[PDB]
Amino acid sequence: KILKKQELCKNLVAQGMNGYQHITLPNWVCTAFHESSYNTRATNHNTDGSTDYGILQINSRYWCHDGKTPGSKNACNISCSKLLDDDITDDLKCAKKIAGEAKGLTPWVAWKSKCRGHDLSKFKC
Numbered sequence: 001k002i003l004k005k006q007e008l009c010k011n012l013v014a015q016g017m018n019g020y021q022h023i024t025l026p027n028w029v030c031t032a033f034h035e036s037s038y039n040t041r042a043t044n045h046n047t048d049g050s051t052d053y054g055i056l057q058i059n060s061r062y063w064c065h066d067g068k069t070p071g072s073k074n075a076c077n078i079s080c081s082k083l084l085d086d087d088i089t090d091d092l093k094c095a096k097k098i099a100g101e102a103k104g105l106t107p108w109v110a111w112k113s114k115c116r117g118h119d120l121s122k123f124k125c
């Protein structure tokens with residue numbers, strides 16, 4: 001599914017993502033726009049054999065289990081396939097774990113490159 005920015009905003013708020021680790025909503029939305037274009041089915045295969053899944057591009061070496069990644073840690077304790085469906089509840093709950101361990105949005109390479117220090121007025125909720 002390709003979510004509309006306001007459905008994304010409603011989900012974020014409902015999952016208590018506003019101000020989580022002092023991360024504002026426009027930051028979470030810009031991240032999701034540059035990571036996946038809001039595509040809940042987005043996937044990216046990496047050089048180390050892992051794959052990034054869903055709207056927040058959650059990785060199968062550290063966070064989710066896909067059954068084919070070397071050195072999987074499955075830290076969110078979830079099948080990666082659950083990150084390719086249309087409900088982003090579990091996707092958002094995993095992202096909170098990622099962001100909580102990093103104390104910020106640094107795990108996401110698109111946020112750093114396309115959101116940090118740029119205008120976020122296009123991404124307001």
Ligand SMILES: [Ca+2]
Nearest residue numbers: 082083087088
């Ligand atoms: Ca999901």
